[PDB]
């Protein structure tokens, strides 16, 4: 199971871990990407979760955009976990760098609460431009169902940590 991690609430865990290696290791049974509305796994969380499936989940994400067109922001749809999980959640937070909508963050932490477990990012942070803090504020107000974040930064895990109230 999840080792290592930091308990928040009653049903947030957080630990400074690369995302795709803590894949690997526990072989979740939700994997969270932090996709776009193209499921267009470039960079970041996405692109980092794509190349670990040797693009597996780009070429999937591709038939799945063609079948049915693009997510919303603050929409989600789930797709095969690959090498990394049973299922990923692909998640569209909203990009503050896209100039979208910050008021989406809730509606996109809404869709982990159809999961009993998963292993998650700090949806919208990152590439996505915004307040990592403000990210997990939401996270810990909106999900209720049992959600282990995994923080790359390990200076970004030490602030949010000791800013959280
Ligand atoms: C978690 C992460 C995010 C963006 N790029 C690389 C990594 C490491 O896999």
Redesign the pocket.
Same mark, same amino acid.
């Given at each position: 199971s999840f080792s290592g991690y930091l308990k928040l609430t009653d049903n947030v865990y957080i630990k400074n &871990?690369? @995302? /795709?290696?803590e894949a690997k290791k526990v072989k979740p049974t939700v994997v969270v990407n &932090?996709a776009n509305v193209y499921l267009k796994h470039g +960079? +970041? /969380? &996405? +692109? =980092?979760?794509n190349? &670990?499936t040797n693009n597996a989940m780009q070429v999937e994400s591709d038939d799945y955009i063609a079948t049915n067109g693009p997510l919303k922001v603050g929409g989600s749809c789930v797709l095969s976990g690959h090498n990394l999980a049973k299922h990923c959640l692909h998640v569209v937070g909203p990009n503050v760098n896209k100039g979208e909508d910050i008021q989406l963050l809730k509606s996109a932490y809404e869709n982990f609460n159809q999961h009993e477990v998963l292993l998650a990012?700090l949806l919208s942070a +990152? @590439?996505f431009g915004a307040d990592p803090i403000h990210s997990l504020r939401v996270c810990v107000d909106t999900v209720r169902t049992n959600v282990y974040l =995994?923080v790359?930064d390990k200076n970004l895990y030490d602030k949010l940590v000791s800013s959280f109230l």
């Open positions: &871990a690369d @995302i /795709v290696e &932090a +960079g +970041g /969380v &996405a +692109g =980092a979760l190349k &670990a990012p +990152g @590439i =995994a790359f």
